[PDB]
């Protein structure tokens, strides 16, 4: 059979920190996958070269699934954040060769085309309410279906940046914003809430029920989901949207949350829950209850990972949004890629494979730098949810 | 304030990989922890050394809980075996510092003493039914008052050793094992049987009601547990005790199997769950349901990892039994610490902090090598659970 | 080992009742612990000093788990306001004695600092609601952050007194309160109140429902909650904050109000709920829910109470907030401690021990004296909760 | 109105320590309730003499229900031991006064005779299998129908005495004893078993399971109760009869393992349990599932509680068997009563009241003396329960 005979780690920096694998063949065909885990990236470096990639020289790199398997069930450790980035960019590695054997762009392989383009956010950001009503206005004149509004609320505030935070004075802020975007703008937009990690239940059920009369497409990671209970009491007492699961992991991170039925969008990325194997058996299971797909789309999933994404959108039926925050044009360039951006909406292209690739040469002139996520506390120091 | 100057890894082979974060103060006192994954040890290291080390340097190590929650809630990518490894490292070596400033060991700073000496489990393995039976008898002649016994099955079988597995050929085999065992040495012993996530669970149902008449101390890890619904049917079948979690690292793996009355122990470990800080919230849970704690203890939990172990064990109201495998000479040299094994039991001692230190000069004289755990496979080739 | 050689019950009157236990040793070290039971204070004398004192005689008090579980389970009848009294004040004495040996105030021994000052609400009271809102301004202007309210209502009322109460007179007017506060003062200020026991299920959803536009931090004691399943139908109708447990004294009576999420806070203190050693165990399994400490502070908890209670809020990751009523500058003399008050805070200082103490020879000047809690009836008589 | 004019508690110790409340009035008529609480008897007197009976005087002793509520409404601080055990003996003076003025004995006010006499069981106890056998037997013929029989296992075990325990040699041991009764008895007798609280419930379970062959009347106190989904795997498992309550105090303490259908037999007592008033409701809901009334029956119960016991149990409809210890020649003298005991069964008398008093000048003759019930603990020492 074929064989794997390397798999490579590339590291980069092109305005931000991106890992790679590159899992190369003895026939000459590679595939490449993202690794990239933000705040945390040489830890997935270090699982993937001194770990994984040894494990994979010698194996046939058509079997999608028993690679899967043997690095999931095979690490003995299960889940988590650092593993299913691993096994995320080796899966989408194999697909990319797999789609590139097919001669088919990957979207082919998984089932074929369901839509046409693919609906995206933005981030409308303000200081203030005024500043995020104008932010909006620019995203709509943008021809942006969706926008995502956030807001700074006053008297909130190389190592991590800490951040404040104090619950009432948002809830007593937060739904004003809302109410001046549906005064100046009207009801025909998507408007989208992201409220970090930072409510309780209860508290997330009251400004869920604030946010009703404006008709909100989702409030987002309303609260910490390692209890999959936590969503209960909001689900009970509003009928504002639900979104959660960017930072979820696999499929065991949801399937009470999905099954439930307490959420509306489910927010795993093919980097974030083991790549495109995974993300379908989450997909699938989010069918069933008419729970729809709204993939995190920050920059710091690069563009490997956008391909990939873009993709599974382009197929999957359940489809419900894809998040978009735009890289850089060196972060473009190091990473060429068969994708664009028009009226609203991202296109897969017809690429065989997922259409991404690498260029080694200039990636090399972008040298690695450590970054991290900022943190949050409560105004009386208590470490918080950021 | 004290403040933290370094958070080092060191990184020593006396046997078997073991991985330790040695943090030291502007005061004198330093502290050590745990960070050892067993094959996949340097993504650990990695995790540490270039993300959350250079975070805690400043910071004082008085504030164990505040730590922990930085750590923890401050990565952003919750939970894991990679995450949760360099959390319990931090917690383990804070602790160590508070029960030096304290001048006293760390079992006293827990709530002191609830029992003189540990109960614990050796392990009895042979490659049929009368080698098995003649291991236990040498674990009996050596006091042991536990046992667990583990079979090879006449028709199974630096890179990961492939091992093969049938289902239907253990079932009809494992169950005589324990009927020879209690012919040759009745009841008194308390025997162990570890299913090795073999079973699913209609298997393990079935398993357990076979192993009923011979009244086990548990069946361990019977079926794969990221569903935690998954022990449902073995409960509702048996009443043969069951037992599961070494490869468990949060809370959030447990709660149901805990509330929900699936589990009698919970085998959760100081460094694989998050430190004491973590461990002690697990126990509690536990205890609520009398589950008891029977924490995992094969030799790639090094002996800072057995002293706080022990410290816990020697405080905690709901102790059940503490897995004991031995490590090596060149381990024991490089770890020195004031724990022993008499008759059946470990005893922790009364030196301050939990008892353990690093020789580094000594530890620098065995090389990392890489080494890896086994993985099995069906006979028709199907990736399974080792 | 160490010993201890009294364990004396020390009682007082500076402008109330407050009964200490004072755990005295061989090496010369001594602990103090609150054992004050509002209004039948003297069954917990006799508790202590009759039977539980006596077998303490000797006991090792490093040993603070061990004791707990020798007077919780030896008593043979379990939990209770009586047992639990005598149970938290040995409690106390202990880890007094624990801090004092380690050199370290108490909240390091729990895991150190989480929080900087720790956030009160005092007693906003009034005749009738001109009068309550005139008191709720002056706490502001005081600084407080957070206000309790309470209102007589119009048309309601050495021995007990006897008080009346209508509900239907209070649904009628209770609501009406809060809406002249929030026009008054606005949103930013944390606004409580307590429903003491007053109501059924469906009367405290019907006012929780009512209480939502004026966004309450909570209702408290809505309805009485020996049944447990009590606060089920006012969870599933308001989203209005709930707490409950001054009056609870154990995990037991409360473990399913914060399962089935039906509070936000829990209200049990160190007095209360048998020491930090069993508190501790009621704060983690309400984290578990994002379920917060709301400890009571009325002043028929003494100030070694109030010392313990600080430790406990300085360390605890889910504070919520601490009640605080003063005490009177006699209590203040009697009872030597080391905590303050500014700007709506408490601080806890940094002496070993949980910082309180016990003046014996001024105690002896203030002789105990017979006070009672009132009680309530129905304006047709019928025996109600006060 | 009549009026409460003394409520006078009375301490003696006529082979052992009991209290009694004796209520008197302006009329001439008294009556008279149990207070004994085994091995805290001083904390309840307390509660009485110095909280509770000041609040009595000039109340109208003919509002039996006003009374209890305001006694158990008014302590503000619910339930408990302590407090239960004040507002029973209250309640039996109460009772014992109607009856006495209504010229009737306490059963014709409760209903009526529901049955002729009350079966009652004994205690045959041995230090093996062969002496517990020969108790058995003496008891058969004695004319008992029913008999608990408790054996010492081989291998285990003024202030409390320490006893030792051990699980695995118990459940080695203990199905052996009801295997030889009935090998030797057959199974015309009713058997007991007391599990005296020493199993987790999955060893309760198993225990159960064991003694299904035999036929056991019930297996009592399996595993402590607290919790009351504790007994849930216990009911899943087997069909051998549980038993559980004596030291339960109201009726919150049973509801769901009463509703879940999780015992068969409820063991709260007059005295335990809030008196007359109070375990009638408990019986009214175990009627309902057809759970009947097991009242504990042990010797420090005095002769009141046995009278107002055997009285309740000549009424009420679902009783199941009442526990008889027989009191010394000494208490009988003191607490001159009119039930006897004949051929297996009590029988209760027709003089009005509760048909037992108190001879206070004979009373006066037996000085209080300490006594403590025993306390357990595990091999390796750790606390248990008794
Ligand atoms: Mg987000
Ligand atoms: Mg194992
Ligand atoms: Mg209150
Ligand atoms: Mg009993």
Known sequence: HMKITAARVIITCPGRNFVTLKIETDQGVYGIGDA?????????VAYLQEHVA??????????????????????????????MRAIAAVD?????????????????????????????????????????VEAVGHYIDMGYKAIRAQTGV???????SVTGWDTRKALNYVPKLFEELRKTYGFDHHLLH???????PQEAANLGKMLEPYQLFWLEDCTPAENQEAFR???????????????????????????????????ATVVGAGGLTHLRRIADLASLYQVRTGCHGATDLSPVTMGCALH???????????????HTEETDAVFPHDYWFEKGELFVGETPGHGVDIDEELAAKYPYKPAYLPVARLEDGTMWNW
């Open 312 to 326: 599974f959108d382009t197929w999957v039926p359940n489809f419900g949004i894809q998040e978009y925050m735009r």
């Open 54 to 83: 040894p494990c994979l020289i010698g194996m046939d790199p058509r079997r999608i699934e028993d690679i899967w398997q043997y690095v999931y069930r095979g690490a003995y450790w299960r889940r988590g954040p650092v593993t």
């Open 92 to 132: 989408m590695a194999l697909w990319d060769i797999k789609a590139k054997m097919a001669g088919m762009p990957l979207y082919q392989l998984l089932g074929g085309r369901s839509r046409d383009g693919i609906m995206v956010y933005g981030h409308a950001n303000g200081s203030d309410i005024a500043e995020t």
């Open 154 to 160: 006053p008297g909130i505030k190389s190592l991590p």
């Open 233 to 267: 009491l909001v689900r009970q007492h509003t009928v504002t949207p639900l979104a959660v699961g960017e930072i979820f992991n696999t499929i065991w991170d949801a399937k009470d949350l999905i099954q439930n039925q307490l959420i509306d969008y489910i927010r």
């Open 194 to 200: 992201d409220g970090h990690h930072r409510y309780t």
């Open 36 to 44: 990239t885990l933000n705040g945390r990236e040489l830890s997935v």
